[PDB]
Design a protein around this ligand. Sequence first.
Ligand SMILES: O=P([O-])(OC[C@H]1O[C@@H](O)[C@H](O)[C@@H]1O)OP(=O)([O-])OC[C@H]1O[C@@H](n2cnc3c2nc[n+]2cc[nH]c32)[C@H](O)[C@@H]1O
Ligand SMILES: O=P([O-])(OC[C@H]1O[C@@H](O)[C@H](O)[C@@H]1O)OP(=O)([O-])OC[C@H]1O[C@@H](n2cnc3c2nc[n+]2cc[nH]c32)[C@H](O)[C@@H]1O
Ligand SMILES: *[C@@H]1O[C@H](CO)[C@@H](O[C@@H]2O[C@H](CO)[C@@H](O)[C@H](O)[C@H]2NC(C)=O)[C@H](O)[C@H]1NC(C)=O
Ligand SMILES: *[C@@H]1O[C@H](CO)[C@@H](O[C@@H]2O[C@H](CO)[C@@H](O)[C@H](O)[C@H]2NC(C)=O)[C@H](O)[C@H]1NC(C)=O
Ligand SMILES: NC(=O)c1cccnc1
Ligand SMILES: NC(=O)c1cccnc1
Lengths: 250, 250
Amino acid sequence: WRAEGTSAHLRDIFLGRCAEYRALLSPEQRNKDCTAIWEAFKVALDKDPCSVLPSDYDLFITLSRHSIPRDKSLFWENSHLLVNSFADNTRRFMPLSDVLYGRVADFLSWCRQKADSGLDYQSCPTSEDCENNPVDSFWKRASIQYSKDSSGVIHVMLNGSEPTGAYPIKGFFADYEIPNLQKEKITRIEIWVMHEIGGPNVESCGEGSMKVLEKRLKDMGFQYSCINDYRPVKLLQCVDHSTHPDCALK
Amino acid sequence: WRAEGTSAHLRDIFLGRCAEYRALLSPEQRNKDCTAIWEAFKVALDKDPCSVLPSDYDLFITLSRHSIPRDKSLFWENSHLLVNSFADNTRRFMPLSDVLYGRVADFLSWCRQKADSGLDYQSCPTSEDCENNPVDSFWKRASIQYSKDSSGVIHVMLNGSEPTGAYPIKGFFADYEIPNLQKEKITRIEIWVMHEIGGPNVESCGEGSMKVLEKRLKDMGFQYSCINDYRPVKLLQCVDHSTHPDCALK
Ligand SMILES: O=P([O-])(OC[C@H]1O[C@@H](O)[C@H](O)[C@@H]1O)OP(=O)([O-])OC[C@H]1O[C@@H](n2cnc3c2nc[n+]2cc[nH]c32)[C@H](O)[C@@H]1O
Ligand SMILES: O=P([O-])(OC[C@H]1O[C@@H](O)[C@H](O)[C@@H]1O)OP(=O)([O-])OC[C@H]1O[C@@H](n2cnc3c2nc[n+]2cc[nH]c32)[C@H](O)[C@@H]1O
Ligand SMILES: *[C@@H]1O[C@H](CO)[C@@H](O[C@@H]2O[C@H](CO)[C@@H](O)[C@H](O)[C@H]2NC(C)=O)[C@H](O)[C@H]1NC(C)=O
Ligand SMILES: *[C@@H]1O[C@H](CO)[C@@H](O[C@@H]2O[C@H](CO)[C@@H](O)[C@H](O)[C@H]2NC(C)=O)[C@H](O)[C@H]1NC(C)=O
Ligand SMILES: NC(=O)c1cccnc1
Ligand SMILES: NC(=O)c1cccnc1
């Protein structure tokens, strides 16, 4: 297996994060059973590391699902840490990592041993090793639910400094999120193409892969808009480059 | 009493946070027993809610204590959320909330019932109800250790928009941290007096209580400097006021 092995203390972390998140839920939906959610989740840990399907996580989603505020969804590519920091634990936005079922798995890895009941802490399969591995099937199931339950203005943070372009035509956003958005429930889709401070401008709005994305969204009937280096996010990036000209204040 | 009851799922939250923090420790000190740490913490918990002393947490500290990188300490008053965000989970600085023994308690509340052995989830005592309460004694013990183990350049974030002054002569910083700093291993102390965007300029460096702080630190023999609205932090505040003139980029 060419992927990271199971995360140490997976259970304590999972339950801990689930417990903390409940407070972020409104009383009406605050009644969640972290123990039951964990039990449903670990069903993938009793199966062959290459035989886990997205649907195996149906119960897990059923027990952890909650509503996502209108206009607060944030999709992304190649911008993991910036998305989490900008979202600020649901205070500004609610990316999947800030939704209960995504929150319990952010940064984690897991899989059972090939021929043993115990968890494999050495390594886990990648899509390359085999398509139906625990982690990929989880994020497929999770991104599908996240997308279906989003409404209002859809925000997407892309990395304009990524060498392969801002929009990967193959991946979760393209293959599992875009196809599951509820057109009738969506106002418009707004893209933020972020560039590293001084970093390279590989692609900006309307260039390369961005043209492909723009065309697909528009062909699907979505109202579209793209912003290069959306200011609120640029300011966050600048916190670590305060003396850089791109970050100088008037 | 007058304070909020003990946090729900305290144990799961405690253990999860402990488990996640371990990854943030140097391999040389990553050897931490979260369950044992919890038990040591419980020693102080399972007592009369008005009979807990800082020393009751000695075992808890001993089992969770680890080193703090030189020049990475960040003390503060009246800016809890700004400090946590700026520190960015030990990435920029290591405030007490980003040190193992502080991390497991950040935002939490706890106390055992006055007459029953179970935890009191209804309410907990304040300094007013009684001085020796679980939470206050905890932070006293923790702030002492955090101060004793800090070295190099000392950073302090104060709120210059606080009505009553930037430096509270009665607070944990003044009463439990300043007196425990080890001058021998400290190079200098640097203050950042932050003002709310457009917010009020109650006090800036060299004014009111700030004069009190400067004189006390200099009387103790420390090298001192103060900065109004330290840029990196101002940029972070600006993320939420991108259009405000104080935040306009060059
Ligand atoms: O590997 P990275 O350089 O990031 C940093 C990562 O380096 C890894 O060693 C370490 O685990 C860390 O998370 O780039 P990455 O984009 O591959 O980001 C993949 C990460 O983002 C998390 N994640 C949060 N939201 C989602 C998601 N995963 C899938 N989906 C599909 C729809 N939504 C999501 C997921 O838990 C995964 O870890
Ligand atoms: O009450 P707040 O509006 O905060 C917001 C929170 O007050 C909590 O009751 C409620 O749950 C609320 O979410 O403002 P606050 O400044 O009083 O900050 C007090 C908070 O800072 C945490 N904390 C992190 N570091 C320390 C510390 N507490 C003491 N010390 C002494 C030296 N170092 C520290 C501590 O855990 C406490 O929650
Ligand atoms: C946006 O993409 C760039 C380019 O892929 C990322 O920067 C690279 O990050 C890797 C790993 O941290 C480094 O090894 C490279 O040297 C970086 N390249 C450059 C040109 O800086 C950047 O981290 C991405 N931004 C976000 C928020 O994820
Ligand atoms: C710095 O101090 C100011 C003033 O005490 C804080 O602002 C107040 O915050 C409370 C609680 O959020 C509000 O109800 C008041 O309306 C605010 N007043 C003003 C004048 O802003 C501010 O939050 C503090 N800064 C930080 C980072 O904690
Ligand atoms: N934000 C995403 O769509 C995503 C997909 C795959 C891995 N990490 C993040
Ligand atoms: N950082 C501190 O000194 C402090 C003091 C009292 C309450 N919260 C934080």
